[PDB]
């Protein structure tokens, strides 16, 4: 009968097209340790994810950019 | 009074559904076309095959 | 710079009140200070002693170790003036030694969600962060984001305000790897609006009168976390379903809806979980 | 003020008492004044009350020759607006520029700005001056606030 | 499937979508379950890249706020089209 | 009592409008039924070919 995964695509597009209708807000979640733990960071493990999550570049957009939005014509 | 004030608001709720229905219309017309292009391909590939 | 912080605020905003000293400003005379490669520190400060163009006999101002090192290695120093700031912007030398320097130390300073602009780079602590309380609600309550700073909340009132002004719908999307607190930073957006967008029933720590549905907005999730949440080797409260969440706001703007949608239940375990893993919680509860 | 209208003020004072001896709570000052042909801002009154917080704002007492001088000391007044001032100052929710005003937002300004209105205060000023989409003709909302 | 719809049954103009991904799951034994997880996870870096760069600029551009478009060489769509795509060479 | 009924007529309208969209949805999933079917047919068809 029609598969799990293709029906999952018949839901994936319901997950992820709505997401391109919706303005994003982001939570850029790093893992400090691969050991489950409270408090444990690793100096190379974070540094890796600072490159894998794209931080240098992710800076050079929103470093210039705006947290708050709120409608200006109302603001005038 | 009480019917009036309410009819007003429920219509905005039917507006919430209204957009989403066109969003699904948009999607189902995508899916259809996905399927037509795949069928159009398989028909023409049947010929060549 | 700003109002200094409480125990809870200290985890909301960085300690913005940075300071200034003559010694680091006198030491500037050693303009040949450059950052140099290290396993142990990532990078440390050394100084150019003899410039071979592409090499330089550089010498550490720590161990005094003369290391002839290349110009391309030597990463021009960044003075403390930009220390561990609110955004990932203000560091003059946008460089490897220093980008690293601003996030490495930022989680560790308690301050997980890091404004790199709007998107907040978060490092999942696996901890009861104090930044979720009706102090952090009634202070964040529909509030102006000067005092409502880098947090899943902060973006969530940016969302809650903008949406209702602009009429463009809003998504809040966590990223990153296993047990990186998508699972939680979500339930914070849940803890935010539950007493933020919603109707004050008339009207500390966690103790307060939530609204009726808004109570159920919190209580939605522990029901699901019985019926779909399971330990793994990585996360002991792992979510054995991934989900999308939605918080539907009305015409005037309050929480009308809360739509959580499941894709894939990781059912496979329900018979036989591997070594040091648990099935769905509710079993063990019952 | 004439003795006539001041007698009416003497009553608008006299009514509002506590222990029965010519004593009005600070709180009541502006509101009584407001009915007495005046709209004195909380900031205006707070000047002529001496900056209480909520505690001694609720606790401190007026008496008639503290009240009636206060009334006067705002009443002969400086800036107080007219239609032209308030059409711009109520074009204040025009969203594009539309000659009609934003429904939620007129409520929000009233919660969000200076003299923070309750929900109650906000809704009362605004309600039913919008249409189906919630656009308020301010050109009229102005005259409504300016006379009544 | 019964339960999550009885939950939403009690819970449900604007909305706020949020995404708890049972997520970026690198165990040893990574079965199908773990793939299509790390797929939406893959998509979600590519959502950042398509958002804070592109669509955050396109929320800025839905406005015409002073925004210089800046791209950084971070399009991941080939790794998604590898996992996702039905015909042509399949995913 | 008459103003109310004007708004009632108007409600039924938006309900109808919800229904042309939800009818087109029900058109497009059946449109797509014949489409999906044809592909999975032409796939079996292709296997032999």
Which characteristics define this entry?
part of a larger assembly; 6 chains; A: 76 residues; mainly alpha; 4 helices; D: 148 residues; two-stranded antiparallel sheet; 5% strand; elongated
What does this structure look like?
- It is classed as contractile protein.
- This is part of a larger assembly, with 5 copies of chain A and 1 copy of chain D (148 residues).
- Chain A is built from 4 helices and 1 strand.
- Chain A has 76 residues and is mostly helical.
- The N and C termini of chain A lie far apart (59 Å).
- The longest helix of chain D is centred in the N-terminal third of the chain and has 12 residues, at 3-14.
- Chain D is mainly α and 148 residues long.
- The chains are: A mainly alpha (76), D mainly alpha (148).
Write the layout of secondary structure elements.
The structure is cut from a larger assembly and holds 5 copies of chain A and 1 copy of chain D (148 residues).
Chain A: H1 4-16, E1 23-30, H2 43-52, H3 55-62, H4 72-75
Chain D: H1 3-14, E1 24-25, H2 28-35, H3 42-49, H4 54-59, E2 61-62, H5 64-75, H6 83-91, E3 101-102, H7 103-112, H8 119-126, E4 135-136, H9 138-146
Antiparallel strand pairs in D: 1-2, 3-4
PDB class: contractile protein
Keywords: muscle protein, smooth muscle, myosin subfragment 2, heavy meromyosin, essential light chain, regulatory light chain, motor protein, coiled-coil, contractile protein
Entry title: Heavy meromyosin from Schistosoma mansoni muscle thick filament by negative stain EM
Sum this structure up briefly.
Chain A has 76 residues and is mainly α. Chain A has helices at residues 4-16, 43-52, 55-62, 72-75, and one strand spanning 23-30. Chain D has nine helices and four strands, in the order H-E-H-H-H-E-H-H-E-H-H-E-H.
Give the assembly state of these chains: part of a larger assembly
Sheet of most strands of chain A = none
Note the main sheet of chain D.
Answer: 2 strands, antiparallel
Radius of gyration of chain D: 18 Å
Measured as a percent range, the helix fraction of chain A is 40-55%
Approximate shape of chain A:
flat
Tally the beta strands of chain D. 4
Number of strands of chain A: 1
Shape of chain D: elongated
Helix share of residues of chain D? 55-70%
Strand order of the largest sheet of chain D: 1-2
**Count, helices of chain D:** 9
Going by helix content, strand content and strand pairing, the class of chain A is mainly alpha
